[PDB]
Amino acid sequence: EVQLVESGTEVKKPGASVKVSCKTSGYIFTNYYIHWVRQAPGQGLEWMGIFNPNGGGTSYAQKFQGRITLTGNTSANTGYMVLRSLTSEDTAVYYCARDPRTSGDNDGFDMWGQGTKVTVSSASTKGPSVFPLAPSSSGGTAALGCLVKDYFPEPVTVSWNSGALTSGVHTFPAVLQSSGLYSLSSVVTVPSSSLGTQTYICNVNHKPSNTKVDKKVEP
Amino acid sequence: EVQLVESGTEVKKPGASVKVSCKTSGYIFTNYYIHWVRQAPGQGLEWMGIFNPNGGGTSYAQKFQGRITLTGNTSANTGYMVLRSLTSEDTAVYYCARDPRTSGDNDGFDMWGQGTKVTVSSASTKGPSVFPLAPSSKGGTAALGCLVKDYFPEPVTVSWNSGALTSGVHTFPAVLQSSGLYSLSSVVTVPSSSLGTQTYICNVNHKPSNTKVDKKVEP
Amino acid sequence: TSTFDRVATIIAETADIPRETITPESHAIDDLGIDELDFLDIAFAIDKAFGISLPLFKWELDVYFGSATTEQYFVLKNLAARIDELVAAKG
Amino acid sequence: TSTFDRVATIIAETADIPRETITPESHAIDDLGIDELDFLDIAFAIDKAFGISLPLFKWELDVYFGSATTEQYFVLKNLAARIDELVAAKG
Amino acid sequence: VLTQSPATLSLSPGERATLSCRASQSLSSYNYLAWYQQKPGQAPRLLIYAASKRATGIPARFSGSGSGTDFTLTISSLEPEDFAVYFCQQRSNRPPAWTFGQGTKVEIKRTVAAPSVFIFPPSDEQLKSGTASVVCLLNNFYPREAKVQWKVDNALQSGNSQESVTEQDSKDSTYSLSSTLTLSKADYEKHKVYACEVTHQGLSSPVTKSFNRGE
Amino acid sequence: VLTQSPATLSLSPGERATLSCRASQSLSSYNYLAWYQQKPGQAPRLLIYAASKRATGIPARFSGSGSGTDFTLTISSLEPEDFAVYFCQQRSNRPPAWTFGQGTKVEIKRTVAAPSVFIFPPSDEQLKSGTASVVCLLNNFYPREAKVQWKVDNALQSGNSQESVTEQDSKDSTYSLSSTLTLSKADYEKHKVYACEVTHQGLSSPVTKSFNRGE
Ligand SMILES: *[C@@H]1O[C@H](CO)[C@@H](O[C@@H]2O[C@H](CO)[C@@H](O[C@@H]3O[C@H](CO[C@H]4O[C@H](CO)[C@@H](O)[C@H](O)[C@@H]4O)[C@@H](O)[C@H](O[C@H]4O[C@H](CO)[C@@H](O)[C@H](O)[C@@H]4O)[C@@H]3O)[C@H](O)[C@H]2NC(C)=O)[C@H](O)[C@H]1NC(C)=O
Ligand SMILES: *[C@@H]1O[C@H](CO)[C@@H](O[C@@H]2O[C@H](CO)[C@@H](O[C@@H]3O[C@H](CO)[C@@H](O)[C@H](O[C@H]4O[C@H](CO)[C@@H](O)[C@H](O)[C@@H]4O)[C@@H]3O)[C@H](O)[C@H]2NC(C)=O)[C@H](O)[C@H]1NC(C)=O
């Protein structure tokens, strides 16, 4: 299998420089260009530049000229990207992809890496606070939930009743609050008459802080 | 006589991986593909991937790409399927099936295994509570039964009067409740005139949990 | 008679192909310009003439996995061999 | 058969220039009175006569980075060689 | 995509069965389709391949036809063992892929039978647990379609009932249905009249069975 | 620049899908266009290059067409795995540069479903910490377009709300949305009526759900 694998330190201070590595395998390194493409959360793909392992030539998108350097080490089958003067707007998933230098078959970005995150933040690691969204009870259906507030970095995971509760669960994407910390909610709908027969607990994990909280949600 | 036999651990935790063996006999293993097909409860057939013992090649359905690995051991006449990152939506019966590689005769999935169950659940093994459905006080035909509640995993068996009562018995399919446990009822209609002369006892067995319960159902 | 010459006659009778441009080293698709549907009518006629069913899909699938070459099925000299094996398999 | 002489015949058929000024050492641009759109029509004719696709974008990219010279793709004796390589790669 | 119509066929034993499977897009030049039969608790069994070829050992009463987008399985005369679910299947290459239709259930047609309805209060034994399960039974009815509503002190309930149905009975080919209303003991004690109302085409109007908690 | 239309296509399995991509200028760069498919959490995948050439291992139901300024990606009959986001891409020399379109989402069409709306006051737990989060839930609706408006004592709130949305449920293909209103504890204790007003085409008019702090 042809493979490209991105790597790098995720959390970077504003104003700092990040270096991402693209380790490739399964194909002749000097027969393909390396492209760099990034995707901010919720946004589309944005091309950043092209690197040529044969001679080391480059071409960068206008938006990044002056801030970006693409290099490579052909003996290591690895391309590199340095993005300088980072801001919040550089928080994205960063991809490398290959493009044939000397062939007309699959003449496009035919193989890509899995992508690696760069999060430009002044925040420190912080475990979430977990608050109940109590059922104040939809035709014999009640809604309850848990608000997982103020954590860094991503991700948190949520299960209900240690996973036994699956139907009707909606765990929303995290949002970035103006404070620089993330927050998300997880909700579930149940038969209203089950509120007096059944315990409802949200199990919240935040591995960067080793946080594992079980919060019961009571009527 | 040609046959295929699936086997594997049924009860798996969410996020775990399951490995299913398909042991075949009665035919030349290398002359046939091995397909994997699954059937979620009450749903249709879903093709997962094809394994080719002649060289070990595979093609996976796009839905499972990255999550599934198909292998085989020719000298053992056995195929294997690994499915990773399980969720409740992977609870299904998993089939393996043969399909001739070299012939337009019987050109289809012409032999299948008996199927083997995978239940993706965090629940602990628990025997059922058994409650009478008593025949009402208010001639004719009377209905009575037993409610078999809150057990895991499937199945329970129900008999009546230790097999002496079979006519009129209806044992309903099990329902996975929102709590993670299963429930069902078994009912039977008898003449009203028999309520004072014939006793009625449901015999409820749950092999996974060391439980046998005989519940007399009084008028 | 040779199985190849039976096949060449069938191909000349079915499609717009002169019999003397059909050679044993010819690839049925790439060398003689036979479309999909013309080849199906040819397969049908081969199937009737020899009492077999060419497993065209399964041969394509075999080639996809690399378990077989396109030449071992559709170069006509080899297609004759495949037909003879299919005739023996039904025996 | 000379691939160059094949190419030169195509150029002479398309551009309003005499066959005798079309030499193996001539640059298709720069030396023959041929602009970008004329060359695209020549490329299309080359693509059809030989059953190939001149990779004009990727060739120009290669020259841009200096990993290739203009002469190796667009001086006619070298273009003939690139064409033979494309035809051989088509196998 | 394969679409099977209708999803359920109701026929008497001995009748001719015609099952349809249509492809969203024409099935190549191959026109390959396979048909599979499945009974409850059993693995699928190949009936037809290549649209029209019976698999070895399949009775001659099964035949298949079709091309392009339109295909049919025909059972010339239904034997009791033929009431089952039937799936159609197509295949493709580059990449290899197999897809199924969602199946057609061939069901045993019989005369209309109205359900016998019974309502069960929760046992005192369960009420100690703090849970009250109220059960309404619809016994031996045909056809399958039936509506069950719960009324608690004449108020219509929603969202707190679940229903299960048996397969067709081996002897009389009827259906049986349970609807189970689950409540807290506390909520069970805040009301008195529990009523199950059943609509079925065998009945001239919906029928209600009820009890008073504690009677 | 590339422009993709529409932003969202809502279609059912089996239907033909036609996606458009328009360039800023007629594509001088050899009428080249590439199409990519991307699923959540996954890398993009090459479908089409050179406007019309399918990449290796891409099913034949994907086809590309067009030239100059206007291109299309056609999915002749949608399979379930085809519901995803699709991007087009152009390239040029002088200098080397590549650009992507903004993407078209192919989603699963279904019937209009109005949201179930629920409002949640801030927990007493959180209030001890000095902040108040009020949450409004819009459960299981279709289509995705929905408007949430917050009022505090009938005063319209602006700038202190954030929302996020689930992807289409794998079972009923609906969306769910949560909106969170952020207030100071002091602000929260100083007002009484908290209301979330939801506009959606499944409703005859916007629906309001509210609570009074301290009941
Ligand atoms: C691009 O990527 C390539 C590939 O990774 C890098 O190439 C490697 O570079 C390192 C560092 O320069 C090389 O390491 C050196 O290798 C020498 C050869 O090692 C073998 O042979 C000796 C005997 O000949 C054996 O003893 C040994 O076990 C090996 O089998 C070593 O002799 C060197 O050791 C000396 O230097 C190091 C410090 O680097 C000291 O720690 C030692 O004590 C000793 O003084 C050294 O280990 C490595 O060989 C290269 N690998 C390959 C595959 O080429 C490039 O550096 C990189 N380029 C850029 C610009 O990033
Ligand atoms: C696929 O399935 C086949 C068949 O089931 C399976 O083949 C078996 O493999 C085992 C392990 O390699 C073989 O066991 C060996 O047998 C020889 C002959 O007696 C012994 O000398 C070996 O002993 C050495 O290794 C042992 C550990 O394996 C040590 O304990 C010992 O001290 C020796 O160092 C060893 O027991 C077995 O003979 C075959 N059986 C057959 C029928 O071929 C194969 O391994 C499977 N492959 C995969 C990839 O799953």
User: How many beta-strand segments of chain A?
Assistant: 19
Tell me which CATH architecture of the largest domain in chain A applies here. Answer: Sandwich
Question: Which geometry of chain A do the CA atoms define?
Answer: elongated
**Strand segment count of chain E:** 19
| Largest sheet: number of strands, sense, barrel closure of chain A | 7 strands, mixed
Q: At the third CATH level, what is the topology name of the largest domain in chain A?
A: Immunoglobulin-like
Name of the top-level CATH class of the largest domain in chain A: Mainly Beta
**What proportion of the residues of chain E form beta strands (DSSP E)?**
over 45%
Oligomer: heterohexamer
CATH topology of the largest domain in chain E: Immunoglobulin-like
PDB class: immune system
Keywords: epitope scaffold, S2 helix, DH1057.1, Fab, spike, immune system
Assembly: hexameric
Entry title: SARS-CoV-2 S2 helix epitope scaffold bound by antibody DH1057.1
Report on the structure:
Chains C, D: Residues 1-87 form the Carrier domain. The complex is a heterohexamer, with 2 copies of chain A (219 residues), 2 copies of chain C (91 residues) and 2 copies of chain E (215 residues). Chain A has 219 residues and is an all-beta fold. Helices cover 0% and strands 49% of the residues of chain A. In chain A, strands 2, 4, 5, 6, 9, 10 and 11 form a 7-stranded mixed sheet that branches. In chain A, strands 12, 13, 15, 16 and 17 form a 5-stranded antiparallel sheet that branches. Chain A has a 4-stranded antiparallel sheet with strand order 1-3-8-7, with no helix packed on it. Chain A is elongated and about 70 Å long. In chain C, α1 crosses α2 and α1 (3-14) crosses α5. The longest helix of chain C is centred in the middle third of the chain and has 15 residues, at 36-50. In chain E, the strands form 4 sheets. In chain E, strands 2, 4, 5, 6, 9, 10 and 11 form a 7-stranded mixed sheet that branches. In chain E, β5 (45-49) and β6 (53-54) form a beta hairpin. Chain E has 2 helices and 19 strands. With 215 residues, chain E is mainly beta. Chain E has 2 domains: 2-108, Immunoglobulins (Immunoglobulin-like); 116-212, Immunoglobulins (Immunoglobulin-like, Sandwich). Chain E is 5% helix and 50% strand. Chains in contact: A-B, A-D, A-E, A-F, B-C, B-E, B-F, C-E, D-F, E-F. At the A-F interface, β5, β12, β13 and β17 of A face β4, β5, β10, β12 and β13 of F. The structure holds a molecule of 5 linked components (NAG-NAG-BMA-MAN-MAN) and a molecule of 4 linked components (NAG-NAG-BMA-MAN). A molecule of 4 linked components (NAG-NAG-BMA-MAN) binds at residues 73, 75-76 of chain B.
